[PDB]
């Protein structure tokens, strides 16, 4: 049938340090900046971060949102080709071959993913700018060799409660079931295409499967990132707990658990979106198999 939402496309920069998502806040570092607002509220020395978050961090999110909206025309272009390539009825109303429209799909797909990167390059430079400000701002803690770790371990306790709110094993179970069904359908389609002569419908199935493979890859990437965050933060909870550390280590402490938790929330958002995307593609495939086998008369 039709795909009316293509939020599953994302892209990373060339250095592979930043990942751009069409879901707010588009960068995982925004979630880290939101997490550092919590850390700063427990230190009277660094509570001037209240002003930094509402100016620089709030502006970065708005600029990221405006950047994503710029690519809306390119988004509609891809979405257009997708609806023709997965619907044999709409495809027969035009005269270009399936190979030709598939090439157009790849070009318009990469022009759109290229747009979300290109229009967000300056927002990337600002992220590194804000991180170093937070580092310098943490220097004003009134300690040196005996910086208390109570705030650091208090947040770890909070994060374990937050981890338990995510049904990770259901996500893992679902990705393995639909990956298995997807791979089984791919091998199935290459055998029955020799038996049933319906080139248009067969190709619509193959295109949707191509999109399913992409969505499965993104789901598996985010599930692994989320698993890594939970495993690492839980290891810190079970580990040795020093009461005092140096100031530069406490900086890494906050940056460590902050980045882990930012990836956990960013991944939770994407996996919830990719789960919906994959389930909608699966129904299209089995709908297309119904049409392939329902008009044999």
């Amino acid at each position: 049938n039709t795909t009316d939402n293509i939020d599953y496309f994302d892209i990373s920069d060339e250095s592979n340090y930043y990942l751009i998502s069409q879901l707010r806040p588009h960068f995982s570092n925004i979630y880290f900046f939101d997490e550092f607002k919590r850390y700063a509220s427990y230190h009277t020395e660094i509570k001037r971060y209240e002003d930094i978050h509402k100016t620089k961090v709030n502006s970065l999110l708005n600029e990221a949102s405006r950047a994503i909206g710029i690519c809306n025309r390119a988004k509609n272009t891809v979405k257009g080709l997708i609806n023709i390539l997965e619907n044999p009825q709409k495809f027969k109303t035009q005269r270009e071959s399936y190979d030709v429209k598939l090439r157009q799909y790849e070009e318009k797909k990469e022009a759109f993913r290229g747009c979300l990167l290109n229009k967000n390059r300056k927002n990337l430079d600002q992220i590194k700018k804000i991180n170093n400000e937070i580092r310098d701002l943490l220097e004003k803690l009134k300690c040196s060799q005996d910086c208390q770790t109570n705030v650091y371990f208090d947040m770890i306790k909070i994060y374990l409660v937050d981890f338990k709110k995510m049904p990770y094993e259901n996500y893992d179970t679902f990705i393995k079931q639909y990956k298995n069904s997807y791979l089984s359908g791919v091998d199935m389609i290459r055998k029955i295409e020799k038996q049933i002569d319906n080139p248009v419908t067969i190709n619509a199935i193959k295109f949707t499967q191509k999109e399913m493979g992409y969505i499965i890859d993104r789901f598996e990437y985010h599930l692994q990132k989320v698993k890594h965050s939970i495993d690492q933060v839980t290891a810190l909870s079970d580990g040795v707990k020093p009461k005092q550390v140096t100031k530069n280590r406490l900086k890494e402490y906050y940056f460590n658990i902050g980045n882990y938790y930012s990836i956990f929330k960013f991944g939770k958002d994407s996996l919830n979106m990719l789960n919906k995307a994959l389930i909608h593609k699966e129904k299209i495939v089995h709908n297309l198999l119904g049409e392939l086998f329902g008009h044999l008369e």
């Binding site: 306790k157 374990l160 409660v161 981890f163 338990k164 995510m166 990770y168 094993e169 893992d172 989320v226 698993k227 939970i230 495993d231 839980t234 909870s237 079970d238």
Partner: protein
């Protein structure tokens, strides 16, 4: 540091039920899964089930549904295992385990184990007999007869003598257990220096010490 402390050994009659406990420290059980594992002789390891103490939801292995009930008390950080309709095939060591994490389902931390003995035999204290040579090196013995149930704790000189020690598995000869132990020392050590067999049988709250003396006769 993560620690799991289970309750002590149990002797139960066939057809009765037992409830085992496991108290956690170093972590909150509300944030993890608690698991129970059955370790029987020649039967390897067998998963029983798990609980999520946050909402109390449980999952069981099919052979344990309707015979095992897992519960948890977050205020005391304790997880519980109830086994009913017990038979002799449920005599085992029962372990309490914690999962690695929300995204790591394997068993990460274990308790020391709890022995459950399912039998109608009555608890009986052991007799302890010192075994001196027949009257280089010298081997001494200690014989522990007619006790029930397992376990018994045997040490030489309260445990400070462990080299050259062989304590053998107990065998069940008509209702009661028999156990022996040997210790080998250099001939210039015994009987110049004192050597004592220490047997403890917690089930009968008995502690016996027997010094090995040379035979007279």
């Amino acid at each position: 540091e993560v620690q799991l402390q289970q309750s002590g050994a149990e002797l139960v009659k066939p057809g009765a039920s037992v409830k085992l406990s496991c108290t956690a420290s170093g972590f909150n059980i509300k944030d993890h899964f608690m698991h129970w594992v059955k370790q029987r002789t020649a039967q390897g390891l067998e998963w029983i089930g798990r609980i999520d103490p946050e909402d109390g939801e449980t999952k069981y292995a099919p052979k344990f549904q309707g015979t095992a009930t897992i519960t948890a008390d977050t205020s005391s950080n304790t997880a519980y295992l109830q086994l009913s309709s017990l038979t002799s095939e449920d005599t085992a060591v029962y372990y309490c385990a914690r999962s690695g994490s929300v995204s790591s389902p394997w068993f990460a931390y274990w308790g020391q184990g709890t022995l459950v003995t399912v039998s109608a035999a009555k608890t009986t204290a052991p007799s302890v007999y010192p075994l001196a040579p027949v009257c280089s090196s010298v081997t001494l013995g200690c014989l522990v007869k007619g006790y029930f149930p397992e376990p018994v704790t045997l040490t030489w000189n309260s445990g400070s003598l462990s080299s050259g020690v062989h304590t053998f598995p107990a065998v069940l000869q008509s209702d009661l257990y028999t156990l022996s132990s040997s210790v080998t020392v250099t001939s210039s050590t015994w009987p110049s220096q004192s050597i004592t067999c220490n047997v403890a049988h917690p089930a009968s709250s008995t502690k016996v010490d027997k010094k090995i003396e040379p035979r007279g006769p």
